[PDB]
Structures are given as C-alpha cells and as structure tokens.
Amino acid sequence: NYLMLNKSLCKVEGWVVVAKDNAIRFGESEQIIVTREPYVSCDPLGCKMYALHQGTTIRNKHSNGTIHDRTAFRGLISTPLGSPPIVSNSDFLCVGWSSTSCHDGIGRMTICVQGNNDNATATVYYDRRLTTTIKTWAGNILRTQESECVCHNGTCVVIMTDGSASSQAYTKVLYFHKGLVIKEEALKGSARHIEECSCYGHNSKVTCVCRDNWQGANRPVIEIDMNAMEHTSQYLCTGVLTDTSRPSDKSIGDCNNPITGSPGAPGVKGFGFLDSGNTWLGRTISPRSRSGFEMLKIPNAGTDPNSRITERQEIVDNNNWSGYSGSFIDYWDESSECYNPCFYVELIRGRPEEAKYVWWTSNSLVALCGSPVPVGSGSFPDGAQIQYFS
Amino acid sequence: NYLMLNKSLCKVEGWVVVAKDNAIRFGESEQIIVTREPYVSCDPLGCKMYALHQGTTIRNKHSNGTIHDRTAFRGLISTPLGSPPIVSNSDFLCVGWSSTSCHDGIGRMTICVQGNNDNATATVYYDRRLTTTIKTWAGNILRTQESECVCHNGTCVVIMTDGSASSQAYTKVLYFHKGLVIKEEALKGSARHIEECSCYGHNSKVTCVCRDNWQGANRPVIEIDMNAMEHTSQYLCTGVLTDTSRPSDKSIGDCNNPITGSPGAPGVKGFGFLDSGNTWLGRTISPRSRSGFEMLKIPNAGTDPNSRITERQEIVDNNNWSGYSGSFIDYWDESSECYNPCFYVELIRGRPEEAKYVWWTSNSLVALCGSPVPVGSGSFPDGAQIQYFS
Amino acid sequence: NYLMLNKSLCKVEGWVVVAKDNAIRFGESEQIIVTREPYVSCDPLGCKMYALHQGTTIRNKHSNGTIHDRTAFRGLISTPLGSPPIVSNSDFLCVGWSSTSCHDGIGRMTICVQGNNDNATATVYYDRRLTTTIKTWAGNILRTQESECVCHNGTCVVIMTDGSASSQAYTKVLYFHKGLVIKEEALKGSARHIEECSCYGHNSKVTCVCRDNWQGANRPVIEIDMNAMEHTSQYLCTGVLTDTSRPSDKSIGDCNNPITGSPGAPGVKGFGFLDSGNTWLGRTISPRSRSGFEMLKIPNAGTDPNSRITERQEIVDNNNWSGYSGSFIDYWDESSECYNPCFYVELIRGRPEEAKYVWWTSNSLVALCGSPVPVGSGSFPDGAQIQYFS
Amino acid sequence: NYLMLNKSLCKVEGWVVVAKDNAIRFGESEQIIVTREPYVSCDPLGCKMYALHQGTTIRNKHSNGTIHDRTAFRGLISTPLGSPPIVSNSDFLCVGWSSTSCHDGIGRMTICVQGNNDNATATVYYDRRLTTTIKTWAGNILRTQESECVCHNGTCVVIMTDGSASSQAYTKVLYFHKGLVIKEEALKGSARHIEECSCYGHNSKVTCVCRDNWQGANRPVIEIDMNAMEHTSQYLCTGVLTDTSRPSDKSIGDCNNPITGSPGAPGVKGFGFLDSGNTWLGRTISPRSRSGFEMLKIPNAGTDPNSRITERQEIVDNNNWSGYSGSFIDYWDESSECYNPCFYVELIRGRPEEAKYVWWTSNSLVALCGSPVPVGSGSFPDGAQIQYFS
Numbered sequence A, B, C, D: 001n002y003l004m005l006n007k008s009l010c011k012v013e014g015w016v017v018v019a020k021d022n023a024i025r026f027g028e029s030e031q032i033i034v035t036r037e038p039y040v041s042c043d044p045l046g047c048k049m050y051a052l053h054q055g056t057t058i059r060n061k062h063s064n065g066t067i068h069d070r071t072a073f074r075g076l077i078s079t080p081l082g083s084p085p086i087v088s089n090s091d092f093l094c095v096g097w098s099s100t101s102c103h104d105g106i107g108r109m110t111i112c113v114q115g116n117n118d119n120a121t122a123t124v125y126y127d128r129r130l131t132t133t134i135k136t137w138a139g140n141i142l143r144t145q146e147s148e149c150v151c152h153n154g155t156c157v158v159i160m161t162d163g164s165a166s167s168q169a170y171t172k173v174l175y176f177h178k179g180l181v182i183k184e185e186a187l188k189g190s191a192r193h194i195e196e197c198s199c200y201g202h203n204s205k206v207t208c209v210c211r212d213n214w215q216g217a218n219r220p221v222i223e224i225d226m227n228a229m230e231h232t233s234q235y236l237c238t239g240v241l242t243d244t245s246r247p248s249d250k251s252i253g254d255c256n257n258p259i260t261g262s263p264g265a266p267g268v269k270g271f272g273f274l275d276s277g278n279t280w281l282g283r284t285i286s287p288r289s290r291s292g293f294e295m296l297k298i299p300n301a302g303t304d305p306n307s308r309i310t311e312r313q314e315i316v317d318n319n320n321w322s323g324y325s326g327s328f329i330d331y332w333d334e335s336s337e338c339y340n341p342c343f344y345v346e347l348i349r350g351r352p353e354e355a356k357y358v359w360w361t362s363n364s365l366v367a368l369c370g371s372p373v374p375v376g377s378g379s380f381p382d383g384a385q386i387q388y389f390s
C-alpha cells in the first residue's frame, strides 16, 4: 500500500476553509497547549494537525518565556484536524524543537530534532518506533521543514539544514525508507540558503518552496525526482516577492539569484504550488511584518521572470496577525483523479508583536483547500481579544 | 450498503426523552463549548449531536458577543448523543455558520456555509473529505437546514436558501451523490418562503417541514419523490399554527397560502411528522416567545384544513426557554419494521431573552423518540440557574 | 454468543479491592460529575462503572440541592471501571432517576425511569437503541434495581417496584429479550416489600438480595428459575440483620417474615451471595447510620435460622461513610470454571450527614472481588477531607 | 503469539529522548494526576507510561500530604507514552502502593500490592481480570519492582520482597503464567538485600539490576534462566558505585559483597544493561542526593572488579532533581534484529527536597532509547518553576 505519486495537481480557482482550531480564543479559559510552527499531514485514515508544543498551556505561569524557540520542554504533538490542542486530544510523538512528519502509505515517519545548539540530534521514528538518529554535521542548530514531508514508492524525502542562519549553511536532501536514511545529497543548484521547505508531491516528483533566510526575498525552490532520488535547486522566477520581509515587487524576477533589499526580518516559512498557469503563491500582506495573508495566482511564476499576478484571494486581512504557512495534500483521496492543493496558515499571537499585552507566544491554525470553481470571499483571523489575557 | 427508504413511520402514541446533555448546567464550571442551532443525525454505528460552535466556551471572556449569528470563528461539531459538548469529546467537522449533515448508509455527507454575507460559499464533505463547493447564487447569506438531511439509494436531498430573509428569496432543492451535486431544482409549489427545513424519510420519499420567515405563521411543507428526484411545496392545512410568532389558531387553515397576523418574531425552526391519523406537530407553547414546547397530535394536519388537536404532550413547560426543534430518525434500526420518529428541542439560554443576567447565548439539548404505546408525563427544561452566571 | 449461566459461584475466603475511583478527592478540583446510586456491569469486552449523574459537577454552583433524588437533569452514565467520572470519559446512556443495565452476551440492555412521580415511564434500550417503554402501573415512582440485571439464554430478568415506599407496593418480575418484555409476574412469596434488588446468576438461576423498606431489617430474597422464568420470594433466614437501620442481631431469624425494631432509617440497598457454607452478606457497620462496611461469612444464612457469623472482613471502618452496596460478576471470564463474586460499595459524601460542611451529596466507589484463598486486611474509605469543600 | 526472548541487546553508543511528559509544568494549571515511582512497558500495540497515582491532582488540596508512600487512595495508572497523566487519558488498572506490569505477547499481566503494612496482599490481573492474590509472607510491606516485569514462552518473572527495609528480608522470585503463580524460589546467591529490581530480557534470560537498601552502595544483580526458571544473585563487580547514597568510587569493586560507607540515604531504584563491552549503568550525579542523572559506559562492569568508566552521557544536570530510574525494551520491534535498551528517569519534585516551596511531591518523566551510533548532547530536567506553586 505504498503511496505512488501518480497524479497531477487539481486546477485551483479559489480556496475555502476546511479547518480552524480557534486555539487562542479557547485558550482564554480551556487548557490549550502553547504551540508554534504547526502543520497538517494526512494518511489513509484522515488528517491531523501537527505542532511544536512548549510543555505548558496558555493560562499557566510557564507560558511566560514561550517566545524562546528551543527548550528541553518542547516536543511534537498531533491533534485531530480542526480541534484546538489540549492534553486530552493530543498525541505526544517525539521530543524536540524542529520537526517533520509524513505517511508513506503504510507507515508514518516522523522526525524531531532535540538537544543543545552545537550538539543536536535528529530522532527518527517509523510506525511510532525509534529507527535512527542523525547527529549534527555542522554543529549549529540541526533543523528541518516544520511541515509535512512527502513519500513515493516507499521512499520519503526530507530537507534538513545545519549551520548559520544568516550566511552560508549546510543543507542536505535526505531519502528515507522505513525511517532509515538510504541516500543523502548535499544541496545542489543556485539556491544560496535553504530553510523550512514546504513540499508537495505530483507525478513521481516533489516540489519544495523554501525560505532564504540569508539574502533572498524571493523564495528558493527545490525540485526532486523521486524515482532517481536526485534534486536541483533554484529561485522562483517572478518579481512578485513572497518572503517576509521583502522590498516592493519587481517587474523582472531572477530565476537563479536572490533578490535583496529586505527591510528587516530575514524570512518566514512559506509555500507555493507550481503548475504552469495553475500556479499559486502565498504571502503575508505586509512586506515588513507577519500580518495578513493572501493567495496570489501567478501563471508560470516558477519559470517566467515577467510573470504577473492575475488573481488574488485574501485569507487573513492586514489588521490581523499571521505567520508560517505551508503546503499539504490528502494523497489518499481515491475518488479524485487529481491531488488537491491544501495549505495552512499559522496565526501567531503574543510576543514579540503583542509584548505589551502578554508574556507568551502561541498560535492558532486555519487550513484551506482548493476548489476548481470560483468561490466566495471571507477573512479568517485568529479572533482572540488579546486584552482578555492581560 | 446504501440506505433505502423502504419503511413507513411507526405509530406514535407518546414521546420519551432519550438524551439530555444539560450543557448549560455543566457550563457553569466545565469548559462547555458555546453553541446554537443543534441537531441529531444517526448512521449505522449510532447517533451524535451536531451543533454550530462559537469558537469559545461559556466561562470564557469570548462568550461575550455570542448572540451574533455569523463569525469566522463558527464551525460544526459532532459530539456523542447525550453528552454536553467539550473540546475533548467533540469532532470539529467544518467551518461555517449554517450546516446540515446526513449519512447515506456508506458515507456521511456534511455541509458548512462560510464567508461574508454577500459572498458566501458552501463547503461540502463526503467521508470527511472536501468534495465540492457551492457559491452564493443570490448574494445574501447562502444558508441551509440546521438539521439532518436525508438519503436514499445513494442520493441525499438538501434544502438551501439564498437571498432576503424578510421577502421573496431563492430556494433550491439539491440532490447529492457522494458529496457532488447531481441535480438542482428551484423551489416549486405554493410555499412563498423557505427556511430551515426539518426533513425525514419514508417509503422512498422525504417530507420537509419548514419555516416561512416572510408572511406565514403556518409552516410550509416540501414533498420530495426520491426516485424521481422531483419535489413540490405547500403549507400545512391545519389552522393550528405552529410557527413562532403566530396569531391565535384558526378554525380553518390554508393548504396553499400563508396565514398572517404574527405579532413580532417572523419565525423559528420547527418540524412535523405527517402520517394521516398518526400526525404530530411541534410548537412553542408561547405564541410570541421561544418559551415552552409541546407535541400536538393533529390527524391529517397535512391534508385537512378543518383538522383539530386530539392529543397533547408537554415537553418543556411555559416557564422555561426553548428554541429550535427538528426531526431525526435512526434509519438503521434493522430490528424494527418501521422508522421511529424522533426529534430534538434546542433550549436557548442567555441573550436576547436573558440579557440582564448574561452577555452570552448558548443552548442545551433534549432529544425525544416516539412510543407506539401510552407513556407518562414530565417536563425537561434546560435546568440552569442563570443567576449563577452573573 | 448468548450468555448461558452454566457455572457455580467460586469459593470466597476473602476480598480484595479491584477498583477505587476516588471521585470526591479528585472532585476538589477536577470537574467530577455529581452522582449517586452507582454500580458495576461487565460484558465480553470488560467492566464499567454505572451511576446516576445529577447534571452537574461538584465544584459547580448547581451541586447545591443534589440531595434530591429525582430531577429532569438526572441520567445514567457509564465510565471505565476504576476511573472517576468526568464528561470526557463518560457515556451518557439514558435520562432518568432510577436505572439498571446488563449484557446478554450479544447486546447490552439498559433501563432508565424518567418523569413525574405520579406519571413515570421506564425507557428501555437494547444495543443503545430505544426498544420499549413501560408506563407506571401504580402511579407512584416506578423504580428499579440500581445495580446490574442478569441474563441467560437471551433472556434478562429485571425487578421493578411501583407504589408506596413505606407500605404495600406493587413489584413485578420482568423478563426481557432484546429490550422487549416477553413475560411479567407479580411478586410471589412471603417478601412483603421489595426495593433495589442486587442480583447475580448461577447454574441457570438468578438470586436477588433486596431491601424491605417497610417492616423488615432482615433482607428479602427473590429466587428466579431462568429457564422456566418463574420466581418465588422469601427472607434471609439468619438473625444476623444486614439492612440499615436495624435492631441488634437475633439468635433466631425468620425465613418467612420481616423482623422489625428498626430505630429510624427504613432501609439501604444491599446484597448477599447465597452458596451454602460459602455464604457472604454485606452490611453497614453502624446499625443506625450508613457508616462503615463489613463482609460477613454466615454459612447457610439463606436456609438456617440459627446461622452464625464465622468470618468477618472490614472493608470500610466505622469512622467513614458508606451507602449502597450491590453485587456484580464477570460472566465472561472463560479461563475460570466458576463465577467469582464481586461487589461495590457506594461511599456517600455530603448531605444529609455532612450538611454542616457542604450543600451537595455525591459518592465515590470501591469495588471488590473474591479470592478462594486467605487475604490480608485494609480499610478503603472515600478519603476526601470534606472541610476542603466548605 | 507468546514473546520468545530470542534476541541480544543492540550496541549502544549513546542515548536520545523519546518521550518527556512535562507533568509538573502542565500541573501548574491542568489537572495533572499526582504520581510517583513511574515506569514504561511496551506490548505489540505500543508503549505506555505506568505510575502510582495518589488519588488527587496537583492543584488540589488533597495534594497536601502526598509524600506518604502508602494510602488507600493509591493505584496504578497507564497513560500514553509522552503524555502527562490526566483522568481523561489514564487507565486505572488496579489499587495499591507498589506495582509491576508486563505483556507476554498475548496478554498483559499487572500486579498491585494493597492493604495495611503488616497485612498486605498482592492483586494479580491477566488481560485486565483478577486471576490470583498473594498474601504477605513476612508481614511487613509486601512489595515489588516498580518497573516492568519480563516474559518468555508464556512465563513472566517477577521479583518481590517482604520484610524489613533496613536489614535481612524475604525476597522471592516468582514465575507466572496467565496471572497464576507456577513456581516460586527464595532468593539465592550473595545479594544480601533486594529491592525494586529493574529487569530486561535477552536470549531466553532476564537480568535484573536492583537496590540494596541495607548495606550496599553497589547494586545487587539477579540472573534468571527463563527456560529452567532458576536464578542466582550477585553484586555488580565495578567499584564505580551507582546507588544513592554512596561513598566515592573504588579502584576495585566486589562481585560478592556489598560495599558500605553510604553517607545517609540507604538507596534509590536504578538499572543497568550488562552486555560485556556494551555495558551501561545509570546513576544520580550527586552521591548524596537524588539530583542529576548520568549514563556511564563501563565495559564488563558485571564481571570485572577493575572495570572503569570509558564513556559518559549527562541526561539531567546536577542543578536538577531526578529520582528513580528503570529499564524497558520494546520486545515487539520485529524490524530490528536486536533488542534496543531503553530507560526512564523519574524526575521528583516537591517534598522532601522542596519542602519550603510546596506541600506535595510528584514527578515528571523522561524516557530514553539507545543508538548504535554517536549522538549529540542535552540536558532534560523537569522544567517547572517550583515557586509558581507556592
């Protein structure tokens, strides 16, 4: 029952919300687990939300200090898609402060990276059993995708980075079978820096849209042949810039070099679906802050430096906080002849942005899937009144 | 294993309570989810309560403002029948502020309507996967039944309305197979306005008892042939008026026109079971407010304008709040040769009626099923002391 | 897979605790459901605690007034044996203020009695579906066992009473098949009053030890032939009195008449296992109040008026509150050649006895099973500090 | 499907964290169950945490006094590995204040010891049904392993002790089949006192590393032949002392006699894996207090009195509290040709050590598994700020 990526992407004319956990609203009174960098992964039995918990709930004195990325009290949880995460409905999968997870059609592989900054180790599980460990190779925050990996013919591909966040680093493309590394390649191609890849599968290939945290406000792209287990890397061709922060959009993009100019923030995790005319990119509305979120239809954004926005859908209006965004697909919808693009938006609340109200940072989640036909409109922000928490 | 509606309704001589979640009483301390417009739907594995949550619990500061019908923080939950809804026992099914759900014998179809008032879209799921989307066709609060739909031979019928709440609107009768629209008809017949249909199946047909929010205090009725997938509409014939608000009962009803005179409130969701002599209608006891609830036996209420009440059972006494009511049936009770009529009553607490005590509105649920033999008596109100919440 | 009562009782030399939910201790902070009159019932998949909830938790303002026996907010819950009951782990089975439940080997039958005092109806379920209703026949608190019923060859026997609590009443022995009454007998024999029977099965028979709430401090006994579906009734023969309240033990008991003299309280639910020399009776230690609990070995207590106590085990010491007690047996322990006697003790806290500390009454549960070999000793009281709740 | 111990231990070059429940951090607000002496046990369907609860949660007034070891309100719970224990996710398995549990490949056997200090009885369950009881034989706190037992060919071995904690006592090696004792041996060999054995299986044998609470700061060891069901006992040979408290390490250890000198505390539960060069022992970092935890690689520690530490991994740094530690193995990882050593560390918080902050004592849990390859580093302490609880 190994997943074979034998399908193309569905045409997407618009997006609808399939899940929204409202975690922060509920978190005002219920024991909602403090989380960040969430994502969604499906498998033959359904879909679940995944997130990095902070070993505390919101209305808990330990919520103080949760802006920090890496502690010994972090781990990966999965909770039913659409539900806010509480202890009672959450599966504690592994311990660590960076993660990825995916199902190969028979078993789920999940990875957590734990330990000190200079001496970290990735813990790899298959079917919920420890299978292998991978030591830091650069000695500086070994880290991975923060969204679902993708599998094909029993092999799952994972993108990991080790080394400096703000200059040249050491990224590897890893191929796993049953939670064991069977092949590794150092990053090839023109992408100068790779972080937090959002990946999806199609026709025996995997496309990853990533984060250049070094120089680029245009997103790097990794292309993987899953049968040959080889890859190459590049940048998106559009001058429509979709990282944050970023300068104004250019008339002409650069397929092979990072476009610089970014005001301050070096990056945010994002995604895109590259399918010629059926090409959609995600983007914070603010070019400076993680506020708002919009889906842009940009035909051939992956190949044409003169590509332009043709359609736009607002997901979160610019008066509200967003954050990470990543791709996922139900690869086991056997009643559809195509893979339907889906994505999630992390809705970050608290610090640093709301430091005057609150000592914690957490997030809620909204998840969207594509429709081949025109849809209506609507904004889906976090919805909590932060003052309630002061 | 497709459900075939090959049975008639059981004779009902009286009603007994099968479930009562006591949500508001529990909500005084436990993290009960704030809800409204609930219902019940069965399937081969059992029955569950369905409701529209408000993205908060009662003892949560976000409970303030929950009188509002449509927000981005609303969604559909299912919880085990009889239990009050908390995060731990609730399945978050879709996002939206109007819904319906039913099982076809093999898979469950559920529908949520989400988005802005003028630009709404229905999201349709089959077996918990997004299958189709339906855009607003009138551009004014696309909306549906707020109780279970009904299926036959793999086809499920749904009633939806789009347009003005207080004048002529655009109602469609939709036929689904595996979450895909296979046929649509504009409303036919003499019913002038259709809202919030309560439907049940019998002998390859579906009967819907609805809400005329425009002119009528007598309830419109939709009759559907499930094999031909055609329908017609009408009003109940009785002069015993069962909407709220309503004027006094008339000696002679009108099978083909709305009976006007209503004091204030234009309508409330209700139901009826039309089976000749075995005909029962539901009704708030107050003709002005959503207080009390009574079951009335009115032989041939669906066909005879001179029909009269012959039996009455009080369900909720007039010193207590009620609200919506709708029909449901366990269509998979294979040990019975007949379909037993069941119904639920929404017990609304808080605003607007209890505005001086509280800033929220939510509801509890009581569910009843029929008995072919005389039963005893009893009132089953919400049971919370609203002052405890001040 | 119908249960056939083809086994005898195991020899019991002593008792050990298999479950203790500590509900009141936990109830100091956790949302423990307020309950009373609990019991235990097994089936092929395991054992669960059953209880009558009060539609509230302890640390909830609605806990005020829970001394009252019959409200519209009462129902039957089942929770995993050994766990304290919370909403998250409890199955809300039916609505009512008196109940019984048992598994026939294929399906579980459960019964709740609901409604007004003079107009009550029993609701009967089989495999969690409403099957039949039974109207009050005497018009005064139709009521039943408050512990598990027993089944044989597809037929389950239930004892119900309707009428006066303090004088002659109308008790029926009912035989059910798949939640349908197939036979009823009026009480026969010398027992003058029957309440709250504790029943167990053995060798195609059912023995019930009950409560004479009228005259007798000695317990009435009902003997049922399950193949013939006929019964007879009697009193325990011992002069060792095991109801509460009761006068001092007599040298000579009465097999056929109630022994009077009771100080105040007319009765409490209790049990016994009648197996010649292997005969054990339960008993509050105080002859006046529901405090303490002790198991007494009284050979031939069921047949010999000169029977004497030979062994004694203290379960709850006399400095602590007890309450109801009843019998249960795992009839699906296929690895044992005998049915092992088990019983539960209801540990009542709050009113009326602790009225000066608290406005609620609830209970915790301790459950014991027999051992064919000598065991050690120990007291297992509720364990809550009632002052914590003031 | 009986487990056959047909495998050897995997080589371990280092340890990674697979689970950390963060119970005390969560316990600041969520209803976390108060526990101590936890452990981990696997079976064909996965792994779960086991612990002795105290019949209360942390933020509960009944948490006051939980330093006491033995009450009637103690029992054994199992909760999903990695999750903190709450009522909603915990299985209440038996009642008592000492326990062990293991799966034989077909059914789980679990044991609780309950009752008074001089008159205790072990309750034994197989497949969650009471199977046998074992009365105290020395009349002084009958007690057992506080970690998982081990099974082979349908037989599970358990180590129990009865008698004085601070002098000669009466230890038995018990062999169970389906929860029935089939063989018992009095302790043989040179070990003078045996408490709280940590056991693991390998090649049809079981090795237990225990606690000499009488004289020895070096750990006693029990060797069991599982086919012959015979055992012998000894001490670890190393002069590297791994009990607490303990004097400084000696150059030469004693294979056959306890090494004395211990400052104060007579012992703590610990473990070791004895596999020649692949030999690892656990140890509190402080030789006086239960603070810190370190894994030491000591080749042939079980056979060579001149054995030395060669590798060391810090698990919990010496600024943090630890406690018990024990061994466990997933014996049903069929994709590995070897049994991978795993262990847990109990992280005790509260009294006696933090008596000035708090009136309770509880623990959190961290669980580690081996890796055949070098890993990174990191400390994994409890992580709660005890001042938050004052």
Ligand SMILES: *[C@@H]1O[C@H](CO)[C@@H](O[C@@H]2O[C@H](CO)[C@@H](O[C@@H]3O[C@H](CO)[C@@H](O)[C@H](O)[C@@H]3O)[C@H](O)[C@H]2NC(C)=O)[C@H](O)[C@H]1NC(C)=O
Binding pocket: A064, A065, A359
């Ligand atoms: C959340 O955690 C932060 C950090 O612990 C808390 O802020 C800190 O509060 C302490 C007082 O409890 C401040 O300590 C002070 O430090 C100065 C030196 O900077 C010293 O001279 C004083 O005697 C005092 O000890 C500390 O400065 C302050 N830190 C910051 C960054 O403001 C905060 O109060 C916590 N929030 C809640 C709601 O508890």
Ligand SMILES: *[C@@H]1O[C@H](CO)[C@@H](O[C@@H]2O[C@H](CO)[C@@H](O[C@@H]3O[C@H](CO)[C@@H](O)[C@H](O)[C@@H]3O)[C@H](O)[C@H]2NC(C)=O)[C@H](O)[C@H]1NC(C)=O
Binding pocket: B064, B065, B359
């Ligand atoms: C539940 O929500 C309502 C609405 O937010 C709260 O009522 C509102 O309370 C605010 C004060 O916090 C009032 O604001 C005032 O508005 C007037 C103008 O109308 C302005 O001149 C004042 O300076 C002040 O800002 C607001 O009027 C009031 N709204 C209503 C409709 O009464 C309510 O307090 C909330 N309940 C709880 C328990 O928090």
Ligand SMILES: *[C@@H]1O[C@H](CO)[C@@H](O[C@@H]2O[C@H](CO)[C@@H](O[C@@H]3O[C@H](CO)[C@@H](O)[C@H](O)[C@@H]3O)[C@H](O)[C@H]2NC(C)=O)[C@H](O)[C@H]1NC(C)=O
Binding pocket: C064, C065, C359
């Ligand atoms: C639990 O519920 C009981 C019953 O409602 C509460 O006791 C009652 O408290 C009210 C005051 O809130 C008393 O009302 C008084 O009644 C007298 C006539 O008897 C009237 O003249 C006074 O003006 C006043 O309204 C009532 O007597 C009293 N009932 C009893 C039996 O004492 C009790 O306070 C509740 N407990 C908690 C903790 O809220």
Ligand SMILES: *[C@@H]1O[C@H](CO)[C@@H](O[C@@H]2O[C@H](CO)[C@@H](O[C@@H]3O[C@H](CO)[C@@H](O)[C@H](O)[C@@H]3O)[C@H](O)[C@H]2NC(C)=O)[C@H](O)[C@H]1NC(C)=O
Binding pocket: D064, D065, D359
């Ligand atoms: C946790 O439990 C302990 C033990 O019950 C509490 O400490 C105790 O507090 C009581 C007062 O409530 C003290 O009682 C006093 O005893 C002396 C004789 O020793 C007597 O002369 C006084 O009249 C008074 O009754 C008791 O000494 C004290 N025990 C200890 C060991 O300090 C403690 O307060 C509880 N913690 C919390 C937060 O409630």
Ligand SMILES: *[C@@H]1O[C@H](CO)[C@@H](O[C@@H]2O[C@H](CO)[C@@H](O)[C@H](O)[C@H]2NC(C)=O)[C@H](O)[C@H]1NC(C)=O
Binding pocket: A153, A154, A227
């Ligand atoms: C899917 O994976 C299998 C296993 O790796 C591939 O089949 C193997 O192909 C190699 C040669 O390329 C043979 O030596 C092995 O014996 C094959 N294994 C089996 C089990 O048949 C297969 O080629 C892969 N599919 C694709 C499309 O590449």
Ligand SMILES: *[C@@H]1O[C@H](CO)[C@@H](O[C@@H]2O[C@H](CO)[C@@H](O)[C@H](O)[C@H]2NC(C)=O)[C@H](O)[C@H]1NC(C)=O
Binding pocket: B153, B154, B227
């Ligand atoms: C139940 O549904 C099936 C499928 O729609 C109906 O069977 C189809 O009937 C049409 C003609 O009306 C044929 O062309 C199809 O080939 C049939 N499909 C199958 C799978 O047999 C069937 O008629 C419906 N039942 C009723 C009573 O109307």
Ligand SMILES: *[C@@H]1O[C@H](CO)[C@@H](O[C@@H]2O[C@H](CO)[C@@H](O)[C@H](O)[C@H]2NC(C)=O)[C@H](O)[C@H]1NC(C)=O
Binding pocket: C153, C154, C227
């Ligand atoms: C167990 O129950 C079955 C069903 O009631 C009994 O079998 C029936 O016996 C009657 C005569 O007594 C026959 O007329 C029926 O045809 C039988 N039914 C079946 C399905 O065989 C059976 O006798 C009962 N067992 C005992 C020991 O009394």
Ligand SMILES: *[C@@H]1O[C@H](CO)[C@@H](O[C@@H]2O[C@H](CO)[C@@H](O)[C@H](O)[C@H]2NC(C)=O)[C@H](O)[C@H]1NC(C)=O
Binding pocket: D153, D154, D227
């Ligand atoms: C595993 O256990 C079984 C059962 O105890 C052992 O098989 C038994 O061996 C005895 C003689 O030693 C025979 O008398 C029994 O008839 C056997 N029972 C069965 C079911 O075959 C078996 O020897 C054990 N395995 C090992 C390796 O010792």
Ligand SMILES: CCC(CC)O[C@@H]1C=C(C(=O)O)C[C@H](N)[C@H]1NC(C)=O
Binding pocket: A037, A069, A070, A097, A098, A141, A143, A165, A195, A213, A267, A268
């Ligand atoms: C360490 C570099 C990495 C990518 C730039 O930083 C990320 C920045 C993130 C951010 O920009 O919000 C927060 C992430 N938690 C962090 N990842 C880790 C493992 O700490």
Ligand SMILES: CCC(CC)O[C@@H]1C=C(C(=O)O)C[C@H](N)[C@H]1NC(C)=O
Binding pocket: B037, B069, B070, B097, B098, B141, B143, B165, B195, B213, B267, B268
């Ligand atoms: C928008 C018209 C519609 C039917 C009249 O209003 C209903 C009135 C209801 C009512 O009268 O209580 C509340 C319902 N939540 C609402 N439905 C929606 C989708 O908002």
Ligand SMILES: CCC(CC)O[C@@H]1C=C(C(=O)O)C[C@H](N)[C@H]1NC(C)=O
Binding pocket: C037, C069, C070, C097, C098, C141, C143, C165, C195, C213, C267, C268
């Ligand atoms: C109504 C008579 C009946 C038996 C004497 O009273 C019982 C007394 C019980 C008791 O003595 O504690 C409380 C029970 N809840 C009650 N049963 C019902 C249905 O109310």
Ligand SMILES: CCC(CC)O[C@@H]1C=C(C(=O)O)C[C@H](N)[C@H]1NC(C)=O
Binding pocket: D037, D069, D070, D097, D098, D141, D143, D165, D195, D213, D267, D268
């Ligand atoms: C009774 C002797 C026994 C072993 C020394 O004491 C243990 C000491 C333990 C300890 O040193 O922390 C606490 C354990 N809870 C206790 N075991 C029991 C059953 O009480």
Ligand SMILES: *[C@@H]1O[C@H](CO)[C@@H](O)[C@H](O)[C@H]1NC(C)=O
Binding pocket: A014, A312, A313, A374, A375, A376, A377, B118, B119
């Ligand atoms: C409805 O939403 C779509 C975006 O999906 C937008 O193009 C369209 O203009 C909207 N219609 C109205 C009336 O706002």
Ligand SMILES: *[C@@H]1O[C@H](CO)[C@@H](O)[C@H](O)[C@H]1NC(C)=O
Binding pocket: B014, B312, B313, B374, B375, B376, B377, C118, C119
């Ligand atoms: C019992 O209830 C029925 C209604 O179901 C009613 O007709 C009857 O009069 C009631 N009996 C009494 C005595 O109240």
Ligand SMILES: *[C@@H]1O[C@H](CO)[C@@H](O)[C@H](O)[C@H]1NC(C)=O
Binding pocket: C014, C312, C313, C374, C375, C376, C377, D118, D119
């Ligand atoms: C142990 O308990 C039994 C009761 O089960 C009792 O007979 C015996 O005397 C007790 N032993 C001691 C030493 O208390």
Ligand SMILES: *[C@@H]1O[C@H](CO)[C@@H](O)[C@H](O)[C@H]1NC(C)=O
Binding pocket: A118, A119, D014, D312, D313, D374, D375, D376, D377
């Ligand atoms: C990483 O951890 C190992 C222990 O597992 C240790 O031997 C090594 O020195 C560490 N490396 C660094 C750079 O700290």
